[PDB]
């Protein structure tokens, strides 16, 4: 039959093959060439300081036991053939829970050229660890890494490399950005060696630079806190006799300021230190108690227009303006 030619080629390739041994176990070093096609940089979850990335992981290596001579130069086979030959044991160092998609068939690729060069592509939704220093929250930038290398294979056995130039070995698709909060500034790769309890391993690093956009928090936290301060600023224009009016001004600014303080923290994790949003909330909260203590002293000194009210109608909004022009110019630049 016509298809018998490829069947006997594959059965001659797999005859006498040991898939437990890497190519050139006692003779040379197995060089595995790697590149990543990031199909969609998924959402970054701050609560767990993690991020999801869907990639077309691609590896390539030279195997001398898969040489053939036939009518076709490249054998584009299925996944079944991938489990019967040696494949490198690449694992992600900082991955948490990643799935190799297998719907409707296992998403794998295997192309055996006539000189023995292989190509092994897979789809991996890698959930990795992105450690965060949120001292400048929300006006911060992160470099979420993606470190991968070969388990059970020392530097003297399996080394890794990028198949193209390292500037062009991690390609992010143009439509592929599922980031709603951040935006992806650029990619960054590096290759190094790690010395672990067992031996020295080659690790390949990919840093994804991110930058948080201040659009959700300049409408949920910053602007409501500014409006809460300004609503405490209008209580100085009221009458000295209207004690319940300025009283409900003070207590409602205190309650709205503290419920903004509570509901603002239900966003980032429970870090021990205090972010820039915490400093803004603290200063605005102190301005609200200053507005309340001003009315308390006025009610202590009541019996004419108060000089305390006339001084606080001028000093308090200009001090708020100086605080804003200090804080925003310190943290945005």
């Amino acid at each position, epitope marked *: 039959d016509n298809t018998t030619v490829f069947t006997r080629i594959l059965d001659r390739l797999l005859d006498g093959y040991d898939n437990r041994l890497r190519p050139g176990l006692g003779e040379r070093v197995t060089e595995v060439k790697t590149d990543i096609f990031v199909t969609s940089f998924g959402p970054v979850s701050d609560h767990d300081m993690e991020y999801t990335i869907d990639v077309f992981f691609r590896q390539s290596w030279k195997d001398e036991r898969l040489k053939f001579k036939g009518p076709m130069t490249v054998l584009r086979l299925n996944n079944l053939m991938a489990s019967k030959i040696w494949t490198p044991d690449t694992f992600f160092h900082n991955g948490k829970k990643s799935v190799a998609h297998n719907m409707t068939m296992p998403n794998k690729l295997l192309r055996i050229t006539e000189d023995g060069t292989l190509l092994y592509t897979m789809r991996l939704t890698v959930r990795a660890e992105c450690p965060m220093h949120l001292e400048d929250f929300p006006m911060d930038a992160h470099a979420c890494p993606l470190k991968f290398g070969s388990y059970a294979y020392t530097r003297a056995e399996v080394v890794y490399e990028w198949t193209r*130039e*390292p*500037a062009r070995s991690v390609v992010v698709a143009e439509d592929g950005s599922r980031l709603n909060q951040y935006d992806l500034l650029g990619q960054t790769v*590096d*290759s190094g060696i790690v010395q672990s309890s067992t031996g020295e391993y080659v690790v390949m690093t990919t840093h994804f630079h991110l930058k948080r956009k201040i659009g959700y928090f300049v409408i949920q936290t910053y602007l409501p806190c500014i409006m809460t301060v300004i609503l405490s600023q209008v209580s100085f224009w009221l009458n000295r006799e209207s004690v319940p009016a300025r009283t409900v001004f003070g207590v409602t600014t205190v309650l709205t300021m503290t419920t903004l303080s509570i509901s603002a923290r239900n966003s980032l994790p429970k870090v021990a230190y205090a972010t820039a949003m915490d400093w803004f909330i603290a200063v605005c909260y102190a301005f609200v108690f200053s507005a309340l203590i001003e009315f308390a002293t006025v009610n202590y000194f009541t019996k004419s227009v108060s000089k305390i009210d006339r001084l606080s109608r001028i000093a308090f909004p200009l001090l708020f303006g100086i605080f804003n022009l200090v804080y925003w110019a310190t943290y945005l630049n």
Partner: antibody
Amino acid sequence: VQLQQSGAELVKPGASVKLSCTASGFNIKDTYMYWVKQRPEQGLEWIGRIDPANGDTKYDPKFQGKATITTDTFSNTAYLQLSSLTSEDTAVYYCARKGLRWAMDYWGQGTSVTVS
Amino acid sequence: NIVMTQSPKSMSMSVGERVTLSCKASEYVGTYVSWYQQKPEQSPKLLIYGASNRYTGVPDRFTGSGSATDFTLTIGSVQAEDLADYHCGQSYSYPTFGAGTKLEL
């Protein structure tokens, strides 16, 4: 393991020169081949890149058009094509094999071109 | 492109002391530099790959170092046969080269 180049060349300006180097001990389909320009008493200048398994060639923006790199499979050889030779093209040329961690491992002996 | 700005042009000292080099990058190249020696009437030879990886046949006196942007090549007790010219390259992008540091007596 040995990269043997051609001999020295001396032609008139505005002409064309064929330049070549042959790699032995391995195959060029595995590693990239790099061409470099070394002006006398000057630094190294990268000419271009060729992938012999794919045929894809990448060049420096300042060397596009005047220089192109070709190759063949049977003879295991890389070729240069230089056109519109001038006084500033008088240099010595090496072909460099891409090595471990992209480091320009092996180098040829060098062919000195001269115009008159 | 990536611009290599290695400094200085040449150094002139004696035999048997420490001399250091420097290779400053305009943009990020991450541990992908390379150092070569250039004798007169001689092709370049590889010395250091990666950031600090000694090639086979390199003596132990040749010690490199590297970072994200700043690179250097430290020589310990340089001898008379090492009077050559040193070049710093990069290969994180399409490869470029520096000017060249010479050695003199």
